[PDB]
Structure 1
Amino acid sequence: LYPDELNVSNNPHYRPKPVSYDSTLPPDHIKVYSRTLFIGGVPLNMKEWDLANVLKPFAEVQSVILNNSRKHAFVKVYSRHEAENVLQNFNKDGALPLRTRWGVGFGPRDCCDYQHGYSIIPMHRLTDADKKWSVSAQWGGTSGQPLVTGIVFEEPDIIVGEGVSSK
């Protein structure tokens, strides 16, 4: 891929990819923190670039999927910290009609706690591509560490060509 698409220290979108292990998770389950925000009430005149720019003080945006007719978007930012920063501080005045909350970017929707923005996922409910992306993604994921019971990581990037998803 191109150098801008690589999570490396000379890239200005470089982010560390924290991985931890949680002994409370059930057997053959993993924990994944979302980096994806669901934004509803997107004005009709507002496009992908507008959403990216209005969020820039709080978080650098990686991708936007905007359904303009339905007036909502899914916005993936480069790190979990940045996503939490958005929910904590963005549009607290209600100056814009945008309502922001946790989205799911990875794994089945029914595994997600939408209040806290993470999923406890049984490994059998991941596809082969989900598992591959979890370990080999540029942003999020485990950075080569294999998936085992208890592992905790940030939402990994997924690649549209290369597999079906549990999402």
Structure 2
Amino acid sequence: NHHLYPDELNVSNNPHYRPKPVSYDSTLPPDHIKVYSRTLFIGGVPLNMKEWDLANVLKPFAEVQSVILNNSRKHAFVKVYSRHEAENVLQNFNKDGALPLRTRWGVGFGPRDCCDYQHGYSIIPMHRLTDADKKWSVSAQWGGTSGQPLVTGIVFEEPDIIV
């Protein structure tokens, strides 16, 4: 819908193919999970710049999955295909400051108030996930757990949603 490629699948022959890191963190509270964001907040987006432009400026550093732009308020939300890629964008992209864009973390998944925007993850208690959120966490195309059921301690990358 807001994706570049709406119907794509996360499979070896797709050049956008990515693995789905799942680890388990013993220090999480009972019935809590950890979700690393793939969503990026970009601000200072000039008025002349569009969705395809933003995608292309990040091309060197990361392959872009989706772009919700809001030209009037000068911001956009850009999901990239992997957490590794997002982290690379936050360090290396626009390191000189030639472009007017500023890159900070964003929240694609779970409650907003569970997110650490400095480090870029959410520690979410499972009771604050909708049936939908629990569904997408396991069944998602990019990110998620890919079939591993949700349990205390589980850590995964931001799953794709339906909107």
Distance 1:3 1:111, change over 3 A: closer
- Indicate conservation of the 8 Å contact 2:69/2:75, yes or no: yes
Deviation at 1:2, TM superposition (A): 8.8
The 2-side partners of 1:58 and 1:78 are apart by 12
The 2-side partners of 1:54 and 1:90 are apart by 9
Distance 1:3 1:73, change over 3 A: closer
Unaligned 5+ runs, structure 2: none
Q: CA offsets per residue over residues 43-75 of structure 1, 9 Å max, x none?
A: 000000000000000000000000010010000
The 1-side partners of 2:68 and 2:5 are apart by 21
Unaligned 5+ runs, structure 1: 160-167
- Indicate conservation of the 8 Å contact 1:135/1:141, yes or no: yes
- Indicate conservation of the 8 Å contact 1:58/1:85, yes or no: yes
Q: Which residue of 1 aligns with 2:134?
A: 131
Q: CA offsets per residue over residues 97-117 of structure 1, 9 Å max, x none?
A: 101000001000100000000
- Indicate conservation of the 8 Å contact 1:22/1:151, yes or no: yes
The 2-side partners of 1:124 and 1:107 are apart by 11
Identity of matched residues, %: 100
TM-score for both structures, normalised by structure 2: 0.95
TM-score for both structures, normalised by structure 1: 0.93
- Indicate conservation of the 8 Å contact 2:5/2:65, yes or no: no
The total of aligned residue pairs comes to 159
**Structure 1: 4+ residue segments shifted above 4 A:** 1-4
Q: CA offsets per residue over residues 146-167 of structure 1, 9 Å max, x none?
A: 00000000000001xxxxxxxx
Distance 1:61 1:122, change over 3 A: same
